[PDB]
Amino acid sequence: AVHLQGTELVKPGASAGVKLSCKASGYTFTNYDMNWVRQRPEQGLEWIGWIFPGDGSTRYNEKFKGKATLTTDKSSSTAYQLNRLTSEDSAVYFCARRGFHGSYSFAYWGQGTLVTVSGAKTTAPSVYPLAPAAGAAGAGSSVTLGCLVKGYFPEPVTLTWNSGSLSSGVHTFPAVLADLYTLSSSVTVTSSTWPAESITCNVAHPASSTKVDKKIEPRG
């Protein structure tokens, strides 16, 4: 039962560094070298470097020169990832180990640790109702309403329609950065049912303890 337990996600400021953790278990920690891999949405997976707990120290990837100076510690079988500068280092970092003795392929991986670099502070989201121009209800047999959530930090926010009773025809999209995470959701129902049968989006933001239930109404 080989297992690698990584650390919870952290939100460092665009300036300092953060030491990540990886608790190996189920095998003699010193018998295998630990590896670290980075994964960003646009650049894919990139190997960072390895470490020998038996002590052969390290060997880093050219690209992660001094921005990543690994370290470890026996008597606890945990490996650490320093992360120096940090600013464009926002991504998920993995802890990896190989399986057999003669293949550098990574058979064992940690669950990964998300790292977000931002100077923003906890901020409640503004929620904006999206209704078809001039109220009405479209021009077909179906009408689409929406909810725009922006200016919040940090992730995440939960969004439902009519307290969850409206789940079909819903499209809720991944939030995108921009100082204050912004996301949106659309709901599509039968034209004759709105505004006859009310529709409200419920947005909740754990970090700020805030909730907003914005009803969607015809507008001019």
Binding site: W47, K63, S103, Y104, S105, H171, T172, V176, S184
Partner: protein, 214 residues
């Protein structure tokens, strides 16, 4: 640095069918190559070690071949849970490098996007903000081009796009495109258009509105 190239970011397949992902190492990495699979929000899973060896527990449907500069991952008969990302990785000489990955997706009937455009809400305008939102939902193939036009001229500054992966139920894709201006600039223009170019129609799908005009 050796460069692993996976020429296909996405590959259309079907359940019960055969599919082959290809990988091309910039150099002869001999047989030092591995294949990984990854599902959203999870870590990579080793599927193949040393070019063509199944790791333990990896089902017979998964196969890999090649040795030299060209390698190929194959799935005899695709199953629902195989519609994920597969990564190539050479471990011949450091630094270890991974391919860009290939996402397998379910092929289905072409479907035109339903496009909806929304003017800024009064509540946002009071805060000095003006976001125009455009939804493009339930379309297939994923290939789509969204353009914004303000008073006719195309606008690229201030556009933020978001999309969902292929739906696990209806195999379509959806997308949101938001044009965010300040109320100051928003009120200095009159015509706002969201234009979707998709293979399902010769003419791009267009949705618009005029400030203050119903």
């Amino acid at each position: 640095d050796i460069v692993m190239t996976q020429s296909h970011k996405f590959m259309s397949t079907s359940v019960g069918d055969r599919v082959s992902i290809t990988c091309k190492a910039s150099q002869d990495v001999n047989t030092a190559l591995a294949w990984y699979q990854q599902i959203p929000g999870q870590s990579p899973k080793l599927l193949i070690y040393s070019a063509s060896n199944r790791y333990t527990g990896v089902p017979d449907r998964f196969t890999a071949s090649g040795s030299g500069t060209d390698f190929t991952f194959t799935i005899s008969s695709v199953q629902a849970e195989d519609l994920a990302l597969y990564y190539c990785q050479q471990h011949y000489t450091t630094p270890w490098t991974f391919g860009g990955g290939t996402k397998l997706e379910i092929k289905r009937a072409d479907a035109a996007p339903t496009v909806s455009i929304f003017p800024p809400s009064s509540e946002q305008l009071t805060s000095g903000g003006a976001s125009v939102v455009c939804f493009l939902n339930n379309f297939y193939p994923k290939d789509i081009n969204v353009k914004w036009a303000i008073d006719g001229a195309e606008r690229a500054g201030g556009v933020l796009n978001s999309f969902t992966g292929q739906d696990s139920k209806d195999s379509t894709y959806s997308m949101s495109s938001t044009l965010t201006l300040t109320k100051d600039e928003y009120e200095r223009h009159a015509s706002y258009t969201c234009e979707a170019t998709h293979k399902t129609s010769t003419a791009p799908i267009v949705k618009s509105f005029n400030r203050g005009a119903a």
